[PDB]
Amino acid sequence: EVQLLESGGDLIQPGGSLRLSCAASGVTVSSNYMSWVRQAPGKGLEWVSIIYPGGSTFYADSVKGRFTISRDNSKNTLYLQMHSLRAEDTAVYYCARDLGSGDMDVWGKGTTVTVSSASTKGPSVFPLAPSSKSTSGGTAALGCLVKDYFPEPVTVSWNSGALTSGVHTFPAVLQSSGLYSLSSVVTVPSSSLGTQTYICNVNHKPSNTKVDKKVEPKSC
Amino acid sequence: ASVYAWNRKRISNCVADYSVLYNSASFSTFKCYGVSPTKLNDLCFTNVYADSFVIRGDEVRQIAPGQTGKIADYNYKLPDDFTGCVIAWNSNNLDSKVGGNYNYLYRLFRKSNLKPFERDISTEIYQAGSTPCNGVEGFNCYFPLQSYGFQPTNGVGYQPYRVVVLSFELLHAPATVCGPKKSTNLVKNKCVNFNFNGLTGTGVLTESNKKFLPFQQFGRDIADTTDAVRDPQTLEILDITPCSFGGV
Amino acid sequence: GNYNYLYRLFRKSNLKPFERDISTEIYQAGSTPCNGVEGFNCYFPLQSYG
Amino acid sequence: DIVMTQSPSFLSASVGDRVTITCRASQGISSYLAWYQQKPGKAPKLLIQAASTLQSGVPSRFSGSGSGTEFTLTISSLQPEDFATYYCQQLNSYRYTFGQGTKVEIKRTVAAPSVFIFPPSDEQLKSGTASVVCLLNNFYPREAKVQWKVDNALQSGNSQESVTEQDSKDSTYSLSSTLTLSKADYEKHKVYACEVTHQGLSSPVTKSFNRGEC
Ligand SMILES: *[C@@H]1O[C@H](CO)[C@@H](O)[C@H](O)[C@H]1NC(C)=O
């Protein structure tokens, strides 16, 4: 059927270069307005570049002089050549067919570009200990702080999967160091604090890091 | 006209008074290429072409050499070596209707760019995909023209503008379009340097006694010397007596 | 694009041999006096190379 | 240039409701507007083009209208698959400008957050940094304000926060806020507190601890 299949996204240092490809089926790239559109993590859509059926090309001001859009008729494929990449170029990049006025009806699934100076690093895992003052007949909160890792993602489980109810693992935030940080919390009955062991299991594949952190009430 | 079907007026065999154009305060765009606007009344050309159409204010910048965009690529294209003037003005008062004016169209789909001064009025359904269209609209099969939405509430860049493109053509043929080349008053009984229709000289012009024929212009003495002339405006014959001189 | 190099585009008359003109007076391309104010038919005589 | 202001940023609706999203251009763009729908992790989907032409196959619910400077997307009867983020886009423009987007979320009743504060662990302090974490658990709606206080001084500029997506079971949110100090700064102050204001609380709730005291 009609599909746009893009590829080429990767982790790359600032100042690096990267080419994205977008192979088309059901649509002829050379006969269409074809665009690249990107989406930074947690932000909205930003149009990047367009190539007209007649061959004219245009660019957003934020990428002008650094990106080049092109196509290969024999391969029915669109390209985005990126040079002098910056941290703010980090995004999912979609290729889309433009019906003419800017209204894009055919989109690809996107490919992910990450531009960063950060070194790959496994997280430290610190406990978020349950407070000494907890309601006697109520609920207590505890968790794990998964700090200073790169790149995304990490996975977190509790008691090797045996604890799932009440777990909240939050979206990571990007610190000004360029390293990610995240917390995973669970609410448990305060009565269970003395007898049930709670261990968060943290996995960070890029650093081959696996960490089990026992989270206990703090003693005076 | 709609820009895709731009209108061309061929101007020939006439005196062009360009003072009407560059002395008008009603134009927002008046850019000339390979020619000076004020110095245009002194030039003869073989043909002048006046192309006119309506586009967006956003798009007047595309009516120039070396531009790209939907208008330059697919509707009206000027050459790199263009010799002429591009004139435009806001026409939101005339070309926008309350519900939206749609009588103005532009070509949106074309497989390749127009050549300079090419005019494409095809309405063939455009094949954006693999399957042939056979003149039926649908997915990957689009009508090639699009309508402007000229409403008075549009921003300036989206309001209609009327454009006139003057092209000046200098071929190895007789030049038929020139500029006014006005004249002045004439004085008699005084040494003057004069330039009549095609001849120039120095001398004193005096009331004559000869009877030139209705078609005769320049007199001639026996020794192939200009003797009298017919004033182009006043039907009077003037004798040319060279100004006094002599040895000292 | 380096625009530090300029060229004069207008002048009321052609330069005499070896004449040098560095004046920045506003060229009045129309009938309206400019009075040192740039605008329509009032141009800066210099233009930058691209 | 023309600035597209899309409002509201977040709107809560229920299944079967009539939803109205507004996109305002800084000046007249005729009918040159498109609407997109995007769900988490998926590419955007074109709903309406030219301000009032529902794209083929999009259900009859989605209705687009508006002219000049104010445009609206109307979902006549919201279905479960319509909770998503919606984007407007100026058409026929050199800039291809998008709106900021509107997230349509599942409406439910108000629920106050349970607030918890966590001191930095001794293991982290040995490394020279102190992270203080404030947790807001299972609340609705999403609008919540976390004010860090250190010896009663309101902290700003040294905290980051993160919100979960609506829980698949009870449609609440949870929030985590992390205050980061150096160990040196952390040890110059005693009282650490996060004050939470939320619609479900009659007055702001403060959880606090004293550095060094259990
Ligand atoms: C030319 O015009 C003048 C006035 O401008 C007029 O007096 C004169 O008769 C005209 N000559 C001819 C031949 O028409």
Residue numbers in the entry:
A (entry chain H): 1 to 220
B (entry chain B): 348 to 595
C (entry chain A): 447 to 496
D (entry chain L): 1 to 214
Q: Mind quoting what the paper says about this structure?
A:
S from both SARS-CoV-2 and SARS-CoV-1 uses angiotensin-converting enzyme 2 (ACE2) as the cell surface receptor (Hoffmann et al., 2020, Li, 2015), ACE2 is expressed in a number of tissues, including epithelial cells of the upper and lower respiratory tracts. S consists of two subunits, S1 that mediates receptor binding and S2 responsible for viral and host cell membrane fusion (Walls et al., 2020; Wrapp et al., 2020). The S1 fragment, at the membrane distal tip of S, includes an N-terminal domain (NTD) and receptor binding domain (RBD). Although both regions are immunogenic, the RBD contains the interacting surface for ACE2 binding (Lan et al., 2020).
Thus 5 potent mAbs use IGVH3-53 (bearing 3–10 non-silent mutations). We determined structures for three members of the group, 150, 158, and 269 (the others are 175 and 222) and found that they bind almost identically at the back of the neck with similar footprints of ~800 Å2. Thus for 158, H3 makes four direct contacts (≤4 Å) and two hydrogen bonds to the RBD, whereas H1 and H2 together make 11 contacts and 6 hydrogen bonds, and the three LC CDRs contribute 6 contacts and 5 hydrogen bonds. The most common configuration observed for the spike construct we have used is 1 RBD-up and 2-down. In our structures, we see Fabs 40, 150, 158, and the chimeras 253H55L and 253H165L binding to the spike in this one-up configuration.
